[PDB]
């Protein structure tokens, strides 16, 4: 069973206790560590932070203390955009340029593979033609990795991809059945289902729909997201269920109505450390004094509120429930976004180091 965990390039800038660097990783916590994110320069895989080279060494250096640990480098992300992916996959010449650089890059810093985080083919400015070209990109990487294994005598580089849950994005850019064959595993982003971009309160990652939810809305949940990727061709053993170590917040129209689906004037007050409205790290949520925590019976996930702030998030129980769910579905394991959002150093929730992720590690085995 896999436990895929995401490390983020910018967590090193969080202030005080929240600061996160490779030295803060637990080498046995997860089975696979994915470094996010790498960029692209002239169709070639490239760094995005002044110290990625130094951090790469530290990151992959952990394999010396745990040879079984597998690391991948994730290219893309939201900020990165779609254009560079778009122009790169338009020609066989640029694709080969990208593939060859990836190989050299990965082997150079000792990464075990590449995680594709293009967000997303066929959307966000990306032409619908990118749907098939993405498939072709996946194939080229797979073929090249296949050959490089014999030419180098090293373990075949791994290939994975972080994929959206929404039917809109999935239909627009993913030939599920075709790419699933070539991807070693699929990291399903089963979160961001609801957020401050909606004028009503909703949970970031609920397992099931609300009994009074229907139509498109009844598709905004983990279970529906998993069934879609399975039904479209993803073999269960390759589908990795993503879980959030963060929650999404809202500012209530009135502190008087804290019901799920209650009126929201906007994003919740940004967290002291994460500094982004509408989002909070788990270590910021459990750092709430004089709040009222309640669970959504239907969706199996909690949410808390205080004054006019409302945040739906995941906790030990919810994670335990989703793992239980994951097993019933026979999936390949769990994925986590992100390492730096859980209380990695037990400085806030008084539940020890990595309360959430350690829970996943215990349950998965």
């Amino acid at each position: 069973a896999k436990l895929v965990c995401y490390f983020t390039n910018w967590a090193q800038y969080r202030q005080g206790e929240a600061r996160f660097l490779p030295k803060d990783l637990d080498p046995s916590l997860c089975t696979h560590l994915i470094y996010a994110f790498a960029g692209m320069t002239n169709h070639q895989l490239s760094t995005t932070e002044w110290n990625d080279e130094t951090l790469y060494q530290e990151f992959n250096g952990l394999k010396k203390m745990n040879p079984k640990l597998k690391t991948l480098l994730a290219i893309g992300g939201w900020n990165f955009g779609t254009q560079k992916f778009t122009d790169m996959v338009a020609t066989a010449n640029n694709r080969q340029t990208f593939v060859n650089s990836a190989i050299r890059f990965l082997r150079k810093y000792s990464f075990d593979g590449l995680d594709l985080d293009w967000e997303y083919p066929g959307s966000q400015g990306s032409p619908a033609v990118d749907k098939e070209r993405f498939t072709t990109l996946v194939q080229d990487l797979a073929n090249a990795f296949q050959q490089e294994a014999q030419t180098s005598g090293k373990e075949r580089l791994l290939l994975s991809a972080a994929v959206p849950a929404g039917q809109t994005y999935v239909d627009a850019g993913y030939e599920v059945d075709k790419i699933a064959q070539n991807l070693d595993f699929v990291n399903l982003m089963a979160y961001d289902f609801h957020g401050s971009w909606e004028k009503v309160t909703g949970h970031n990652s609920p397992l099931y729909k609300r009994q009074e939810e229907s139509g498109a809305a009844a598709s905004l949940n983990v279970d529906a997201a998993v069934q879609q990727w399975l039904q479209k061709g993803t073999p269960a053993s390759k589908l990795i269920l993503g879980m959030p170590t963060y929650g999404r917040s809202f500012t209530l129209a009135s502190s008087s109505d804290t019901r799920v689906g209650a009126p929201a004037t906007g994003s919740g007050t940004p967290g002291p450390f994460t500094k982004e409205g509408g989002m909070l790290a788990y270590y910021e949520v459990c750092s709430w004094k004089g709040a009222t925590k309640q669970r959504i019976q239907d969706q199996k996930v909690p949410y808390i509120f205080r004054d006019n702030q409302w945040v739906g998030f995941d906790d030990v129980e919810s994670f335990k429930t989703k793992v239980s769910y994951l097993k019933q579905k026979g999936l390949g394991g769990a994925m986590v976004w992100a390492l730096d959002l859980d209380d990695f150093a037990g400085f806030s929730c008084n539940q020890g180091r990595y309360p959430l992720i350690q829970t996943l590690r215990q349950e998965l085995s």
Side-chain angles (χ1 to χ4, degrees), residues 92-158:
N93 172 62
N94 280 171
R95 277 188 266 115
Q96 211 58 189
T97 295
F98 175 69
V99 165
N100 292 332
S101 71
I103 283 176
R104 176 179 296 281
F105 206 85
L106 297 178
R107 293 303 186 193
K108 173 177 162 62
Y109 298 107
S110 283
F111 272 103
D112 293 295
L114 184 72
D115 182 52
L116 298 176
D117 295 47
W118 173 347
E119 296 182 28
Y120 302 82
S123 290
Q124 290 298 308
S126 168
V129 297
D130 276 338
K131 178 174 185 177
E132 289 189 280
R133 296 180 183 177
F134 176 70
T135 295
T136 298
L137 173 55
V138 167
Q139 191 183 350
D140 292 344
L141 287 168
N143 297 330
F145 289 177
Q146 168 62 15
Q147 190 61 51
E148 190 276 345
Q150 324 188 324
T151 55
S152 68
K154 289 186 185 178
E155 287 285 299
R156 177 179 61 67
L157 289 167
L158 299 168

Coordinates of all heavy atoms in Angstrom, one line a residue, residues 92-158:
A92 N 7.5 17.0 -31.7 CA 8.2 15.8 -31.2 C 9.6 16.2 -30.8 O 10.2 15.6 -29.9 CB 8.3 14.7 -32.3
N93 N 10.1 17.3 -31.4 CA 11.4 17.8 -31.2 C 11.5 18.4 -29.8 O 12.5 18.2 -29.1 CB 11.8 18.8 -32.2 CG 13.1 19.6 -31.9 OD1 14.1 19.0 -31.8 ND2 13.0 20.9 -31.7
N94 N 10.5 19.2 -29.4 CA 10.5 19.8 -28.0 C 10.2 18.7 -27.0 O 10.8 18.8 -25.9 CB 9.5 20.9 -28.0 CG 10.0 22.2 -28.6 OD1 9.2 23.1 -28.8 ND2 11.3 22.2 -28.9
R95 N 9.3 17.8 -27.3 CA 9.0 16.8 -26.4 C 10.3 16.0 -26.1 O 10.6 15.7 -25.0 CB 7.9 15.8 -26.9 CG 6.5 16.4 -26.7 CD 5.5 15.3 -27.0 NE 5.0 15.5 -28.4 CZ 5.2 14.6 -29.3 NH1 5.8 13.5 -29.1 NH2 4.7 14.8 -30.6
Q96 N 11.0 15.6 -27.2 CA 12.2 14.9 -26.9 C 13.2 15.7 -26.1 O 14.0 15.2 -25.3 CB 12.8 14.4 -28.3 CG 13.6 13.1 -28.2 CD 12.7 12.0 -27.7 OE1 13.2 10.9 -27.4 NE2 11.4 12.2 -27.6
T97 N 13.2 17.0 -26.3 CA 14.1 17.9 -25.6 C 13.7 17.8 -24.1 O 14.6 17.6 -23.2 CB 14.0 19.3 -26.0 OG1 14.5 19.4 -27.4 CG2 14.8 20.3 -25.2
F98 N 12.5 17.9 -23.8 CA 12.0 17.8 -22.5 C 12.2 16.4 -21.8 O 12.6 16.3 -20.7 CB 10.5 18.1 -22.4 CG 9.9 17.9 -21.0 CD1 10.2 18.7 -20.0 CD2 9.1 16.7 -20.7 CE1 9.8 18.5 -18.7 CE2 8.7 16.5 -19.4 CZ 9.1 17.4 -18.4
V99 N 12.0 15.4 -22.6 CA 12.2 14.0 -22.1 C 13.7 13.8 -21.7 O 14.0 13.3 -20.6 CB 11.8 12.9 -23.1 CG1 12.3 11.6 -22.7 CG2 10.3 12.8 -23.1
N100 N 14.6 14.2 -22.6 CA 16.0 14.0 -22.4 C 16.5 14.8 -21.2 O 17.3 14.3 -20.4 CB 16.8 14.3 -23.7 CG 16.5 13.2 -24.8 OD1 16.2 12.1 -24.5 ND2 16.6 13.7 -26.0
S101 N 16.0 16.0 -21.1 CA 16.4 16.8 -19.9 C 15.9 16.2 -18.6 O 16.7 16.2 -17.6 CB 15.9 18.3 -20.1 OG 14.6 18.3 -19.8
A102 N 14.7 15.7 -18.6 CA 14.1 15.1 -17.4 C 15.0 14.0 -17.0 O 15.4 13.9 -15.8 CB 12.7 14.6 -17.7
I103 N 15.3 13.1 -17.9 CA 16.2 11.9 -17.6 C 17.5 12.4 -17.0 O 17.9 11.9 -15.9 CB 16.5 11.1 -18.9 CG1 15.3 10.2 -19.2 CG2 17.7 10.2 -18.6 CD1 15.5 9.4 -20.5
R104 N 18.2 13.3 -17.6 CA 19.5 13.8 -17.1 C 19.3 14.4 -15.8 O 20.1 14.2 -14.8 CB 20.2 14.8 -18.1 CG 21.5 15.4 -17.6 CD 22.1 16.4 -18.6 NE 22.5 15.6 -19.8 CZ 23.6 14.9 -19.9 NH1 24.4 14.8 -18.9 NH2 23.9 14.2 -21.0
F105 N 18.3 15.3 -15.6 CA 18.0 16.0 -14.4 C 17.7 15.1 -13.3 O 18.4 15.1 -12.2 CB 16.8 16.9 -14.7 CG 16.7 18.1 -13.8 CD1 17.3 19.3 -14.2 CD2 15.9 18.1 -12.6 CE1 17.2 20.4 -13.4 CE2 15.8 19.2 -11.8 CZ 16.4 20.4 -12.2
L106 N 16.8 14.2 -13.5 CA 16.4 13.2 -12.4 C 17.6 12.4 -12.0 O 17.9 12.3 -10.8 CB 15.3 12.3 -13.0 CG 14.0 13.0 -13.3 CD1 13.0 12.0 -13.9 CD2 13.4 13.7 -12.1
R107 N 18.3 11.8 -12.9 CA 19.5 10.9 -12.6 C 20.6 11.8 -11.9 O 21.3 11.3 -11.0 CB 20.0 10.2 -13.8 CG 19.1 9.2 -14.4 CD 18.8 8.1 -13.4 NE 18.0 7.0 -14.0 CZ 17.4 6.1 -13.4 NH1 17.4 6.1 -12.0 NH2 16.8 5.2 -14.1
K108 N 20.7 13.0 -12.3 CA 21.7 13.9 -11.8 C 21.5 14.2 -10.3 O 22.5 14.2 -9.5 CB 21.7 15.2 -12.5 CG 22.6 16.3 -12.0 CD 22.5 17.6 -12.9 CE 23.1 18.8 -12.2 NZ 24.5 18.7 -11.8
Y109 N 20.3 14.4 -9.9 CA 20.0 14.7 -8.5 C 19.5 13.5 -7.6 O 19.3 13.6 -6.5 CB 19.0 15.9 -8.4 CG 19.5 17.2 -9.0 CD1 19.0 17.6 -10.2 CD2 20.6 17.9 -8.4 CE1 19.5 18.8 -10.8 CE2 21.1 19.0 -9.0 CZ 20.6 19.5 -10.2 OH 21.1 20.6 -10.8
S110 N 19.5 12.4 -8.3 CA 19.0 11.1 -7.7 C 17.6 11.0 -7.3 O 17.2 10.6 -6.2 CB 19.9 10.9 -6.4 OG 21.2 10.4 -6.7
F111 N 16.7 11.4 -8.3 CA 15.3 11.3 -8.1 C 14.9 9.9 -8.7 O 15.6 9.5 -9.6 CB 14.5 12.4 -8.8 CG 14.3 13.6 -8.0 CD1 15.1 14.7 -8.3 CD2 13.4 13.7 -7.1 CE1 15.0 15.9 -7.6 CE2 13.2 14.8 -6.3 CZ 14.0 16.0 -6.6
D112 N 13.9 9.3 -8.2 CA 13.5 8.0 -8.7 C 12.4 8.1 -9.8 O 12.0 7.1 -10.4 CB 12.9 7.1 -7.6 CG 14.0 6.8 -6.6 OD1 14.9 6.0 -7.0 OD2 13.9 7.2 -5.4
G113 N 11.9 9.3 -10.0 CA 10.9 9.5 -11.1 C 10.4 10.9 -11.2 O 10.9 11.8 -10.6
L114 N 9.4 11.0 -12.1 CA 8.8 12.3 -12.4 C 7.3 12.3 -12.2 O 6.6 11.4 -12.7 CB 9.1 12.6 -13.9 CG 8.6 14.0 -14.3 CD1 9.4 15.1 -13.7 CD2 8.6 14.1 -15.8
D115 N 6.8 13.3 -11.5 CA 5.3 13.4 -11.2 C 4.9 14.6 -12.1 O 5.5 15.7 -12.0 CB 5.1 13.7 -9.7 CG 3.6 13.8 -9.4 OD1 2.8 12.9 -9.8 OD2 3.2 14.8 -8.7
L116 N 3.9 14.4 -12.9 CA 3.4 15.4 -13.8 C 2.2 16.2 -13.1 O 1.2 15.6 -12.9 CB 2.8 14.7 -15.1 CG 3.9 14.0 -15.9 CD1 3.2 13.3 -17.1 CD2 4.9 15.0 -16.4
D117 N 2.4 17.5 -12.9 CA 1.4 18.3 -12.3 C 0.9 19.4 -13.2 O 0.9 20.6 -12.7 CB 1.8 18.8 -10.9 CG 2.0 17.7 -9.9 OD1 2.7 16.7 -10.3 OD2 1.5 17.8 -8.8
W118 N 0.7 19.1 -14.4 CA 0.2 20.1 -15.4 C -1.3 20.4 -15.0 O -2.1 19.4 -14.8 CB 0.2 19.5 -16.8 CG -0.4 20.3 -17.9 CD1 -1.2 21.4 -17.7 CD2 -0.3 20.0 -19.3 NE1 -1.6 21.8 -19.0 CE2 -1.1 21.0 -19.9 CE3 0.4 19.0 -20.0 CZ2 -1.2 21.0 -21.3 CZ3 0.3 19.0 -21.4 CH2 -0.5 20.0 -22.0
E119 N -1.6 21.6 -14.7 CA -2.9 22.0 -14.3 C -3.6 23.0 -15.2 O -3.5 24.2 -14.9 CB -2.9 22.6 -12.8 CG -2.4 21.6 -11.8 CD -2.4 22.1 -10.4 OE1 -3.2 23.1 -10.1 OE2 -1.6 21.7 -9.5
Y120 N -4.3 22.6 -16.2 CA -4.5 21.2 -16.6 C -4.7 21.1 -18.1 O -5.1 22.1 -18.7 CB -5.8 20.6 -16.0 CG -6.0 20.7 -14.5 CD1 -6.4 21.9 -13.9 CD2 -5.6 19.6 -13.7 CE1 -6.5 22.0 -12.5 CE2 -5.7 19.8 -12.3 CZ -6.1 20.9 -11.7 OH -6.2 21.1 -10.3
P121 N -4.4 20.0 -18.7 CA -4.5 19.9 -20.1 C -6.0 20.1 -20.5 O -6.9 19.6 -19.9 CB -4.1 18.4 -20.4 CG -3.3 18.0 -19.3 CD -3.9 18.7 -18.1
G122 N -6.2 20.9 -21.6 CA -7.6 21.2 -22.0 C -8.3 22.2 -21.2 O -9.5 22.5 -21.4
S123 N -7.6 22.9 -20.2 CA -8.3 23.9 -19.4 C -7.3 25.0 -19.1 O -6.1 25.0 -19.5 CB -8.8 23.3 -18.1 OG -9.9 22.4 -18.4
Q124 N -7.7 25.9 -18.3 CA -6.9 27.1 -17.8 C -6.0 27.6 -19.0 O -4.8 27.8 -18.8 CB -6.0 26.6 -16.7 CG -6.7 26.4 -15.4 CD -7.4 27.6 -14.8 OE1 -6.8 28.7 -14.7 NE2 -8.7 27.5 -14.5
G125 N -6.7 27.8 -20.1 CA -5.9 28.4 -21.3 C -5.3 27.4 -22.2 O -4.9 27.7 -23.3
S126 N -5.3 26.1 -21.8 CA -4.8 25.0 -22.6 C -5.8 24.5 -23.6 O -6.9 24.2 -23.2 CB -4.3 23.9 -21.7 OG -4.0 22.7 -22.4
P127 N -5.4 24.5 -24.9 CA -6.3 24.0 -26.0 C -6.8 22.6 -25.8 O -6.0 21.8 -25.3 CB -5.4 24.2 -27.2 CG -4.4 25.2 -26.8 CD -4.1 24.8 -25.4
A128 N -8.0 22.3 -26.3 CA -8.5 20.9 -26.2 C -7.7 19.9 -26.9 O -7.8 18.7 -26.6 CB -10.0 20.9 -26.7
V129 N -6.8 20.4 -27.8 CA -5.9 19.4 -28.5 C -4.9 18.9 -27.6 O -4.3 17.8 -27.8 CB -5.2 20.1 -29.7 CG1 -6.2 20.6 -30.7 CG2 -4.3 21.3 -29.1
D130 N -4.7 19.5 -26.4 CA -3.7 19.1 -25.4 C -4.1 17.8 -24.7 O -3.3 17.2 -24.0 CB -3.5 20.2 -24.4 CG -2.5 21.2 -24.8 OD1 -1.6 20.9 -25.7 OD2 -2.5 22.4 -24.3
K131 N -5.4 17.4 -24.9 CA -5.9 16.2 -24.3 C -5.1 15.0 -24.9 O -4.6 14.2 -24.1 CB -7.4 16.0 -24.6 CG -8.0 14.7 -24.0 CD -9.5 14.6 -24.2 CE -10.0 13.4 -23.5 NZ -11.5 13.4 -23.7
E132 N -5.0 14.9 -26.2 CA -4.3 13.8 -26.8 C -2.8 14.0 -26.7 O -2.0 13.1 -26.5 CB -4.7 13.6 -28.2 CG -6.1 13.0 -28.4 CD -6.4 12.7 -29.9 OE1 -6.7 13.6 -30.7 OE2 -6.3 11.5 -30.2
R133 N -2.3 15.3 -26.8 CA -0.9 15.5 -26.7 C -0.4 15.2 -25.3 O 0.8 14.8 -25.1 CB -0.6 17.0 -27.0 CG -1.0 17.3 -28.5 CD -0.7 18.7 -28.9 NE -1.2 19.0 -30.2 CZ -1.1 20.1 -30.9 NH1 -0.7 21.2 -30.2 NH2 -1.6 20.3 -32.1
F134 N -1.3 15.3 -24.3 CA -0.8 14.9 -22.9 C -0.6 13.4 -22.9 O 0.4 12.9 -22.4 CB -1.9 15.2 -21.9 CG -1.6 14.8 -20.5 CD1 -0.6 15.5 -19.8 CD2 -2.3 13.8 -19.9 CE1 -0.3 15.1 -18.5 CE2 -1.9 13.3 -18.6 CZ -0.9 14.0 -17.9
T135 N -1.5 12.7 -23.6 CA -1.4 11.2 -23.7 C 0.0 10.9 -24.3 O 0.7 10.0 -23.9 CB -2.5 10.6 -24.5 OG1 -3.8 10.8 -23.8 CG2 -2.3 9.1 -24.7
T136 N 0.3 11.6 -25.4 CA 1.5 11.4 -26.1 C 2.7 11.7 -25.3 O 3.7 11.1 -25.4 CB 1.5 12.2 -27.4 OG1 0.4 11.8 -28.3 CG2 2.8 12.1 -28.2
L137 N 2.6 12.7 -24.4 CA 3.7 13.1 -23.5 C 3.9 12.0 -22.6 O 5.1 11.5 -22.4 CB 3.3 14.4 -22.7 CG 4.2 14.9 -21.6 CD1 5.6 15.1 -22.2 CD2 3.7 16.2 -20.9
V138 N 2.8 11.5 -22.0 CA 2.9 10.3 -21.0 C 3.6 9.1 -21.7 O 4.5 8.5 -21.1 CB 1.5 9.9 -20.6 CG1 1.6 8.6 -19.8 CG2 1.0 11.0 -19.6
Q139 N 3.2 8.8 -22.9 CA 3.8 7.7 -23.7 C 5.3 7.9 -23.9 O 6.1 7.0 -23.8 CB 3.1 7.5 -25.0 CG 3.4 6.2 -25.7 CD 2.7 6.1 -27.1 OE1 1.8 6.9 -27.4 NE2 3.1 5.1 -27.9
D140 N 5.6 9.1 -24.4 CA 7.0 9.4 -24.7 C 7.9 9.2 -23.5 O 9.0 8.6 -23.5 CB 7.2 10.8 -25.2 CG 6.6 11.1 -26.6 OD1 6.3 10.1 -27.3 OD2 6.5 12.3 -26.9
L141 N 7.4 9.7 -22.3 CA 8.2 9.6 -21.1 C 8.3 8.1 -20.7 O 9.3 7.7 -20.2 CB 7.4 10.4 -19.9 CG 7.5 11.9 -20.0 CD1 6.5 12.6 -19.1 CD2 9.0 12.3 -19.8
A142 N 7.2 7.4 -20.9 CA 7.2 6.0 -20.5 C 8.2 5.2 -21.4 O 9.1 4.5 -20.9 CB 5.8 5.4 -20.7
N143 N 8.1 5.4 -22.8 CA 9.0 4.8 -23.7 C 10.5 5.1 -23.3 O 11.3 4.2 -23.2 CB 8.8 5.1 -25.1 CG 7.4 4.7 -25.6 OD1 6.9 3.7 -25.1 ND2 6.8 5.4 -26.5
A144 N 10.8 6.4 -23.2 CA 12.1 6.8 -22.9 C 12.6 6.2 -21.6 O 13.8 5.7 -21.5 CB 12.2 8.3 -22.8
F145 N 11.8 6.2 -20.5 CA 12.2 5.6 -19.2 C 12.5 4.1 -19.4 O 13.3 3.6 -18.8 CB 11.1 5.9 -18.2 CG 10.9 7.3 -17.8 CD1 9.9 7.7 -16.9 CD2 11.8 8.3 -18.2 CE1 9.8 9.0 -16.4 CE2 11.7 9.6 -17.7 CZ 10.7 9.9 -16.9
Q146 N 11.7 3.5 -20.3 CA 11.9 2.1 -20.5 C 13.3 1.8 -21.1 O 14.0 0.9 -20.5 CB 10.8 1.6 -21.5 CG 11.0 0.2 -22.1 CD 11.0 -0.9 -21.1 OE1 10.5 -0.6 -20.0 NE2 11.5 -2.0 -21.5
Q147 N 13.7 2.5 -22.1 CA 15.0 2.4 -22.7 C 16.1 2.8 -21.8 O 17.1 2.1 -21.7 CB 15.0 3.2 -24.0 CG 16.2 3.0 -24.9 CD 16.3 1.5 -25.4 OE1 15.4 1.0 -25.9 NE2 17.5 0.9 -25.2
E148 N 16.0 3.9 -21.1 CA 17.0 4.4 -20.2 C 17.4 3.4 -19.2 O 18.6 3.4 -18.7 CB 16.5 5.7 -19.5 CG 17.6 6.5 -18.8 CD 17.8 6.0 -17.4 OE1 17.0 5.2 -16.9 OE2 18.9 6.3 -16.8
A149 N 16.5 2.5 -18.8 CA 16.7 1.5 -17.8 C 17.8 0.5 -18.2 O 18.6 0.1 -17.4 CB 15.4 0.8 -17.4
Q150 N 17.8 0.1 -19.5 CA 18.7 -0.8 -20.0 C 20.1 -0.1 -20.3 O 21.1 -0.7 -20.0 CB 18.2 -1.5 -21.3 CG 16.7 -1.7 -21.3 CD 16.2 -2.6 -22.4 OE1 16.7 -2.5 -23.6 NE2 15.2 -3.4 -22.1
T151 N 20.0 1.1 -20.8 CA 21.2 1.9 -21.1 C 22.0 2.3 -19.9 O 23.1 2.6 -19.9 CB 20.8 3.1 -21.9 OG1 19.9 3.9 -21.2 CG2 20.3 2.7 -23.3
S152 N 21.3 2.4 -18.7 CA 21.9 2.8 -17.5 C 22.1 1.7 -16.4 O 23.1 1.7 -15.6 CB 21.1 4.0 -16.8 OG 19.9 3.5 -16.3
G153 N 21.3 0.7 -16.5 CA 21.4 -0.4 -15.5 C 20.8 0.0 -14.1 O 21.1 -0.6 -13.1
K154 N 20.0 1.1 -14.1 CA 19.4 1.6 -12.9 C 17.9 1.2 -12.9 O 17.4 0.8 -14.0 CB 19.6 3.1 -12.7 CG 21.0 3.5 -12.4 CD 21.1 5.0 -12.1 CE 22.5 5.4 -11.9 NZ 22.7 6.9 -11.6
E155 N 17.3 1.3 -11.8 CA 15.8 1.0 -11.7 C 15.1 2.0 -12.7 O 15.4 3.2 -12.7 CB 15.3 1.2 -10.3 CG 15.7 0.2 -9.3 CD 15.0 -1.1 -9.5 OE1 13.7 -1.1 -9.4 OE2 15.6 -2.2 -9.8
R156 N 14.2 1.5 -13.4 CA 13.4 2.3 -14.4 C 12.8 3.5 -13.6 O 12.1 3.4 -12.6 CB 12.3 1.5 -15.0 CG 11.4 2.3 -16.0 CD 10.3 1.5 -16.6 NE 9.4 0.9 -15.7 CZ 8.5 1.6 -14.9 NH1 8.5 2.9 -15.0 NH2 7.7 0.9 -14.0
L157 N 13.0 4.7 -14.2 CA 12.5 5.9 -13.6 C 10.9 5.8 -13.5 O 10.3 5.2 -14.4 CB 12.8 7.2 -14.4 CG 14.3 7.6 -14.4 CD1 14.5 8.6 -15.6 CD2 14.7 8.3 -13.1
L158 N 10.4 6.3 -12.4 CA 8.9 6.2 -12.2 C 8.2 7.4 -12.9 O 8.8 8.4 -13.1 CB 8.6 6.2 -10.7 CG 9.2 5.0 -9.9 CD1 9.1 5.2 -8.4 CD2 8.5 3.7 -10.4

